[PDB]
Design a binder for this molecule. Structure first.
Ligand SMILES: [Fe+3]
Ligand SMILES: [Fe+3]
Ligand SMILES: [O-]
Ligand SMILES: [O-]
Ligand SMILES: [Zn+2]
Ligand SMILES: [Zn+2]
Lengths: 318, 318
């Protein structure tokens, strides 16, 4: 029926065309310390975020899930301003990126309960004093492992999902741990119909995808546009992989996005001369002007695309 | 001549009796993410910080070095309020605790320059828009190692010290790397007369201390009151060690403090009852009502104590 957005409860029927994974603001944990040279320019960031929203609206997007973690500059009030100005639905997350603070609490033996309590509060009561509730729990694991630290969050997320029916979205690191994340979550009673394993496009082996899909979870090809960096494949490989799975009939378990960061938090930077060119399609319009027209050429029917962009998000949050 | 405090430049002659290492506010990196259940209560925190300052003033303290790192809740404007209200001099730090943010910048190959640039800005221009400059560069290393990540900060700090004459204060982890920190800093042109190697009381072997002292640096017995937790020694061992070094004549290189955290940032907690009892002397008055009266019994002369509390800080910042 209803999902919490940065503008309060919204009927899932009205979510419409959805991008399952984009960031209006993002900073790598640690940016906080670089406040002097990497100060947050609120009004310019708002202008940029609002233009990103208008770009997405031009291609029919009505809803964005922004899964920025608590420690990566999540700013629900900022997100509400963007939404209030543009009419875009924005759903935010509760969760942490893939350290000493929650490690200290392990010593006291309250860490997993504290995390669960954080999740419950932010899902059912509100984030700080913003009055905004998260619509998803965000989880992440490391390359090649889900560490003991990370598993605490997975267990807490599974507990919170069982009490709230909240959606879980994950981050996989460099094409690893897709099946493991699914299996561990289900072990702990999470519902596969409410789980999205993310960054599945980071792996070019279709059998890796099918092992993950076999759990009945959603997977996301949510890094379209990212090429060269963080071990990334290329967009062609992503499309090849995606094209193999839809032909196998997996369209009811697959969503697409770019994982853009429209405003970087912390100090500005510049990607070097070869990298920057390769990364030039990393923007919120890329799926619509390049990828989807290519899926058209290979013969993907519009009813399938609508399943991924409309039906799947609608079923997920239902 | 002058040192920057949270109230602007102050003649070093006027610093008087000094605690080299205490925290008005502190949170473990990651506390930022736990905003919903661990919200910062500004007015109550100010009341508590001000009472800590008044406690220190009662025993004659006129100056406190608060080396809270950038990512541990450093709040210079908050510190200036405490000082403005109490007349206490407070000197703050620029630095990071002992990660993905500065790791990302390693990839771009600008990380060490960026850190140096942060240090220069905060030492010579001001922290954010507070108008407050740090008086010390704060460094930290891990247990048993100074990592490649940490060395970047050490190299940057050494460069910044050579341009500014700024004081460096370090954190050693569980009684390790004292001599290594000193040697690596000096390799890179840092001045030993402007370096304090901290938490030296975390090691009970006097020869470890003497290897560190041999570099001509200051060392700090700055964890008085911390007992039972994180592989710590007891206060008696600290005193035993300290008593051995002053008799060897090291008083011109030694400072004392408690490393208190008077207001914890993030979610509140309680210590288990056994831990709890052992930690009960971890407060800003402990040195004055317990430790120093014991050093009196063992025959330490007042002129020696004044060297540590007055002469040493004065020479350090000179
Ligand atoms: Fe993301
Ligand atoms: Fe400290
Ligand atoms: O991401
Ligand atoms: O500390
Ligand atoms: Zn991610
Ligand atoms: Zn320390």
């Amino acid at each position: 029926e209803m999902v919490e957005t940065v503008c309060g409860p919204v009927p899932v029927e009205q979510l419409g065309k959805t991008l399952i994974h984009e960031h209006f603001l993002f900073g790598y944990p640690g940016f906080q310390g670089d406040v002097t040279r990497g100060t947050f320019r609120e009004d310019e960031s708002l202008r940029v975020a609002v233009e990103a929203a208008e770009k997405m609206k031009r291609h029919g997007i009505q809803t964005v899930v922004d899964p920025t973690p608590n420690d990566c500059g999540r700013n629900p009030a900022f997100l509400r301003r963007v939404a209030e100005e543009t009419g875009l639905n924005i759903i935010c997350a509760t969760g942490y990126y893939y350290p000493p603070y929650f490690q200290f609490r392990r010593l006291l033996g309250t860490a997993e309960d504290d995390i669960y309590d954080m999740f419950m509060a932010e899902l059912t009561e509100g984030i700080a004093d913003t009055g905004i509730k998260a619509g998803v729990i965000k989880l992440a694991s490391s390359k090649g492992r889900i560490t003991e630290y990370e598993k605490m969050f997975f267990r807490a997320a599974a507990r919170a999902q069982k009490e709230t029916g909240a959606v879980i979205i994950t981050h996989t690191q460099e094409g690893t741990m897709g099946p493991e994340q699914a299996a561990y979550l289900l072990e702990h009673g999470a519902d596969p119909k409410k789980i999205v394993i993310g960054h599945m496009c980071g792996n070019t082996d279709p059998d890796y995808h099918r092992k993950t899909l076999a759990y009945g979870v959603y997977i996301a090809f949510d890094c379209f546009g990212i090429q060269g960096m963080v071990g990334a494949p290329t967009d062609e490989e992503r499309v090849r992989t995606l094209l193999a799975l839809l032909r196998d009939g997996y369209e009811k378990q697959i969503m697409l996005s770019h994982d853009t960061v429209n405003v970087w938090l912390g100090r500005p930077f510049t990607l070097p001369e070869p990298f920057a060119e390769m990364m030039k399609n990393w923007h919120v319009e890329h799926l619509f002007v390049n990828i989807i027209p290519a899926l058209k050429n290979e013969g993907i029917r519009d009813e399938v695309l609508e399943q991924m962009f409309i039906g799947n998000p609608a079923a997920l949050f239902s």
